[PDB]
Design a protein around this ligand. Sequence first.
Ligand SMILES: O=C(NCc1ccc(F)cc1)c1ccc[nH]1
Length: 209
Amino acid sequence: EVETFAFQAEIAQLMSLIINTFYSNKEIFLRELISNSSDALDKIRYESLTDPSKLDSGKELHINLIPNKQDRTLTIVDTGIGMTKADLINNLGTIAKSGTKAFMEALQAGADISMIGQFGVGFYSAYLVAEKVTVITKHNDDEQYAWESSAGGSFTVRTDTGEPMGRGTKVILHLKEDQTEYLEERRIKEIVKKHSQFIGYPITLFVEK
Ligand SMILES: O=C(NCc1ccc(F)cc1)c1ccc[nH]1
């Protein structure tokens, strides 16, 4: 049972701008997603300070980067707080309507795409490199869900029968044909060291057979 939803108009507009603007500095997508992961880990860590049982679903607080050249996917896994179904539908837990409004004024007032994270919509920079994005998520207060979108104005939500996650979020980037450099180990390492060197959680770059 798959539910299909239209993006709000302002979010569709943001995604088409990200997809269609000529803009070479695509590597910032990884910085934005890792920072989202760090924010989600901060949240569950804060909750556990007063309620240890919040970590019954998983004590480890980390970020894994998993390239797969056969599937042409880069997956960013974190064990942060996760998202409820309502969170997924409501722009993946963001205030994306007012954030997009601000971002797009900033772009006409000098800024560039790399500044997207300052407006709370950094997730959508995934479409700089991905033709389709799948988000699997598990929050302590809900079941496990899969969100998916290839842009084009709609996204789907379904219950995820896949491998159970415990708690956290998995962003699966189905990369564009000409963006496979972001599956290469030395390129990922360079980007992490350049842009995420002060993230307060271990980031493990998985290797391939
Ligand atoms: O660059 C501009 N729009 C294109 C754009 C592309 C991606 C993005 F995430 C945000 C905007 C702009 C608008 C106003 C001044 N500059």
